[PDB]
Scaffold this active site. Structure first.
Site, short mmCIF file in Angstrom:
data_model
loop_
_atom_site.label_atom_id
_atom_site.label_comp_id
_atom_site.label_asym_id
_atom_site.label_seq_id
_atom_site.Cartn_x
_atom_site.Cartn_y
_atom_site.Cartn_z
N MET A 1 6.34 -0.13 6.56
CA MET A 1 5.73 -0.66 5.36
C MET A 1 4.36 -1.22 5.70
SD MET A 1 7.42 -3.12 2.48
CE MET A 1 8.67 -1.90 2.08
N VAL A 2 3.32 -0.76 4.98
CA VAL A 2 1.97 -1.26 5.12
C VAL A 2 1.63 -2.01 3.84
CG1 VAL A 2 -0.42 -0.68 5.75
CG2 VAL A 2 1.45 0.78 6.54
N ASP B 1 -2.40 13.62 18.51
CA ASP B 1 -1.90 13.82 17.17
C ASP B 1 -3.01 13.56 16.13
OD1 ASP B 1 0.03 14.65 15.34
OD2 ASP B 1 0.89 12.63 15.12
N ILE C 1 0.87 -1.17 0.00
CA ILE C 1 0.00 0.00 0.00
C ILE C 1 0.91 1.23 0.00
CG2 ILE C 1 -1.93 1.28 1.03
CD1 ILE C 1 -2.85 -1.36 2.29
N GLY C 2 1.77 1.34 1.00
CA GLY C 2 2.68 2.48 1.10
C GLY C 2 3.50 2.48 2.37
#
Ligand SMILES: *CCC(=O)NCc1ccc2cnn(C)c2c1
Length: 346
Positions: A28-29, A139, A21-22
């Protein structure tokens, strides 16, 4: 083991057919097919064990997300790691697969007023639960709000979360701070450590404003510029709000500025629903003591179509860390991460 773009992604046998995915602050996903539940899932690879603040953030995310159970908060479905501390170099967190996030959506899509309303409702519904556990997210921002293909919204990334501590919120002027600049409440730059629930409401206000126009409302380029942006729209604080800032460095900085008048929300957001702007005003209140709280926000007329306090659940108990995580060496934090993730081993 499968690799993905020059990187081991070691999640089998259960999880296969990895589609990248990104990258991010979340490592890293990838999506992956889950061979037990027979659905695609998200899996994020975390490699924190060398850097102590990485361990702290990882442990916070894990401890909080495992304790919380709420429709508008991302869950952890599984955690994959080596069977021993000595062999554990990475941790994989498995979560429900989401189509997008609000950062990606705002880059590309105009939101209808109905979508803005529904997203805002879900953010506040999730925040009610988080705050009821005496936790501060600290956040909140578009990239931490995940959405599925049916626009169900889930708050993620509790790596900077803290238990609320209003009695120790006070600090001096220009105290350094970690959470994302554009979503920081004015008091962070003046006299606040971000240990009260009002910090999160400010971020949500910023997010609402950003949904209305697809542009960040206060895009500061550096620590003090952020306060320039906020005052550029809110105008100069009143005498009463100024008198609440006892610290002389912070007080006198504000007094040194030329008088700035408030920019009306209806000129900044001419297409916006008027009820949306009344709520926006109450979330983006300069004085954190007068700022609307999460339960008041849910009860605001803008959200009347959705408001139902019996279906806005709270946490069964307040949250607490076992000890302070800021003093623990990384070797104790690795052991704590190992222990916190044990329930997912067979
Ligand atoms: C809190 C932000 C975060 O973890 N983002 C990473 C991410 C990207 C895509 C995706 C799809 N489904 N989930 C869950 C994610 C998480």
């Amino acid at each position: 083991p499968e690799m993905v773009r020059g990187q081991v992604f070691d999640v089998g046998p259960r999880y296969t057919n990895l589609s990248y995915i990104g990258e991010g602050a979340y490592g890293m996903v990838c999506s992956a097919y889950d061979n037990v539940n027979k659905v695609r899932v998200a899996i994020k690879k975390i490699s924190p064990f060398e850097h102590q603040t990485y361990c702290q953030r990882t442990l916070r995310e894990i401890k909080i997300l495992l304790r919380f159970r709420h429709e508008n908060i991302i869950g952890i479905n599984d955690i994959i790691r080596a069977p021993t501390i000595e062999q554990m170099k990475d941790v994989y967190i498995v979560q429900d697969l989401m189509e997008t996030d609000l950062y990606k959506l705002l880059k590309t899509q105009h939101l209808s007023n109905d979508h803005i309303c529904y997203f805002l409702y879900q953010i506040l519904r999730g925040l009610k639960y988080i705050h009821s556990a005496n936790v501060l997210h600290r956040d909140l921002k578009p990239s931490n709000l995940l959405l599925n293909t049916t626009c169900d919204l889930k708050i993620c990334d509790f790596g900077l979360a803290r238990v609320a501590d209003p009695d120790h919120d006070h600090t001096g002027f220009l105290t350094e701070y970690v959470a994302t600049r554009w979503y920081r409440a004015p008091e962070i730059m003046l006299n606040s450590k971000g240990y009260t629930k009002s910090i999160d409401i400010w971020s949500v206000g910023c997010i609402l404003a950003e949904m209305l126009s697809n542009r960040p409302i206060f895009p500061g380029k550096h620590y003090l510029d952020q306060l320039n942006h906020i005052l550029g729209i809110l105008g100069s604080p009143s005498q009463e709000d100024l008198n609440c800032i006892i610290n002389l460095k912070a007080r006198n900085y504000l007094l040194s500025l030329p008088h700035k008048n408030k920019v009306p929300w209806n000129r900044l957001f001419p297409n916006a629903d008027s009820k949306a702007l009344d709520l926006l005003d109450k979330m983006l209140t300069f004085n954190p003591h007068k700022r609307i709280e999460v339960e008041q926000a849910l009860a605001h007329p803008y959200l009347e179509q959705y408001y139902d306090p019996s279906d806005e659940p709270i946490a069964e108990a307040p949250f607490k860390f076992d000890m302070e995580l800021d003093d623990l060496p990384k070797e104790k934090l690795k052991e704590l991460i190992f222990e916190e993730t044990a329930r997912f081993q067979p």
